[PDB]
């Protein structure tokens, strides 16, 4: 048939630095009128690919310089001379010259960028969902990096396990950094047998561990505000 | 400015069959020598070609779902129709379709151009279920130095996707919507975050706006602080 491989298929690299990565077809990928159909693209997190270089070495319009590829016949390369934070994203090499039309397994492109802690908030449930007999408390791990974090539950000081689900953001384009959500799932009546909600952060960028916390039915004390009549 | 729309259902029952459809603006097919090809992208997999048909009519498949595909054309209404039987769960992606175009007065050179936003087909026996939205409240418990975050919580609809812009008319700087994840119940959830000065909270109003096309509903929450 006819298979497309890329080198390699996480890539990180630090912003301003060379990048490099490689496709390989099985056979020759050659059209016989003899152009060779080779395309790169670029797609970014739950978007549509967009063309970089097209024919291996032409660069599509509105494609940055930096951006310019290389090699014939089985061998590819797609070269960014100065890595930049918008670069981010899911690299694929495609091969339209032979049916099937094939693309590359993917190469995720990564900024090594500079450390960075996340800031850590909670949210207890609304009313109204708790209204409905769920509780969802959601902790929020913002603008981090890098990836690896570590978030723990604690309810009235113990640990939970089993009732928890994270979800990561891709690297920001701009920034470089990270998002996660860590959302505690309950039902009404679970969560109204327990008085401290607390979600605990752990990264390669605190020195220690920082918790946040509330406790359920009570405004906290920096939120002090006046009695009314 | 040429464009293509994928459009179609979003839910299909397995063993069913899938009619997409791809519309064009800013040229006629009817008059073109371009091809038109459909590719899909199951989540976190890489791009599968699927189909391609010429101006002329002619068309290749992937030869390892060529007997469940058909790929048309309807000059008329400017479209070209993907036809796809038998529905499987591994089925389930996002589908786009893809322009080959061609460039030089003479015909010198082709390559594909313009793709389509994709369209997200989910192959599952459940039937749809519009979203719930909840408020996530701003409070000193969701704020550190000078930054506040507050949210919405997107919750228990079937199938995906859910887009959530902020402020009736979207804002951004600190946006943050968090991939869905489908949950024990069987329905998806998601939280969309919004991080602003801490300082200006009670100042600015903040109204999440959550659409859910395959179930029709529109939801506006405003999200305020505060209980006591």
């Known amino acids: 048939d006819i298979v497309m491989t890329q080198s390699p298929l996480s890539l990180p690299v630090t912003p301003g630095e060379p990048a490099s990565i490689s496709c390989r077809s099985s056979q020759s990928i050659v059209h016989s009128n003899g152009h060779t159909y080779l395309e790169w693209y670029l797609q970014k997190p739950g978007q549509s690919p967009r063309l970089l270089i097209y024919q291996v070495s032409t660069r599509f319009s509105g494609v940055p310089d930096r951006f310019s590829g290389s090699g014939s016949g089985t061998d590819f390369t797609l070269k960014i001379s100065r890595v930049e934070a918008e670069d981010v994203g899911v690299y694929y090499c495609?091969?339209?010259?032979?049916?099937?039309?094939?693309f590359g397994q993917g190469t995720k492109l990564e900024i090594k960028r500079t450390v960075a802690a996340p800031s850590v908030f909670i949210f207890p449930p609304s009313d109204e969902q708790l209204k409905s007999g769920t509780a969802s408390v959601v902790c929020l791990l913002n603008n981090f990096y890098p990836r690896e974090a570590k978030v723990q539950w604690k309810v009235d000081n113990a640990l939970q396990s089993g009732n928890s689900q994270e979800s990561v953001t891709e690297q920001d384009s701009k920034d470089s950094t990270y998002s996660l959500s860590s959302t505690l799932t309950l039902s009404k009546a679970d969560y109204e047998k327990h008085k401290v909600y607390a979600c605990e952060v752990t990264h390669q960028g605190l020195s220690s561990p920082v918790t946040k916390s509330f406790n359920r039915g009570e405004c906290a004390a920096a939120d002090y505000k006046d009695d009314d009549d | 400015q040429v464009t293509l729309k994928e459009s179609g259902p979003t839910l299909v029952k397995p063993t069913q069959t899938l009619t997409l459809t791809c519309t064009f603006s800013?040229?006629?097919?009817?008059?073109?020598?371009?091809?038109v090809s459909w590719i899909r992208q199951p989540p976190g997999k890489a791009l599968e070609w699927l189909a391609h048909?010429?101006?002329?009519?002619?068309?290749r498949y992937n030869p390892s779902l060529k007997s469940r595909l058909t790929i048309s054309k309807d000059t008329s209404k400017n479209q070209v129709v993907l036809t796809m039987t038998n529905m499987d769960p591994v089925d389930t992606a996002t589908y786009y379709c893809?322009?080959?175009?061609?460039?030089?007065?003479?015909?010198?050179?082709?390559?594909?151009?313009?793709w389509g936003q994709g369209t997200t087909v989910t192959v599952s026996s459940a039937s749809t279920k519009g979203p719930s939205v909840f408020p996530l409240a701003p409070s000193s418990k969701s704020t550190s130095g000078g930054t506040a975050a507050l949210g919405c919580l997107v919750k228990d609809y079937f199938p995906e996707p859910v887009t959530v812009s902020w402020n009736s008319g979207a804002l951004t700087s600190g946006v943050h919507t968090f991939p869905a994840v489908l949950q024990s119940s069987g329905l998806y959830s998601l939280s969309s975050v919004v991080t602003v000065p801490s300082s200006s909270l009670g100042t600015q109003t903040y109204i999440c706006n959550v659409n859910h096309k395959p179930s029709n509903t529109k939801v506006d929450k405003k999200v305020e602080p505060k209980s006591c």
């Open positions: 893809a322009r080959r175009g061609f460039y030089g007065r003479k015909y010198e050179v082709n390559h594909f151009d313009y």
């Open positions: 048909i010429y101006w002329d009519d002619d068309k």
């Open positions: 495609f091969q339209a010259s032979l049916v099937p039309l094939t």
């Open positions: 800013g040229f006629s097919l009817r008059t073109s020598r371009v091809g």
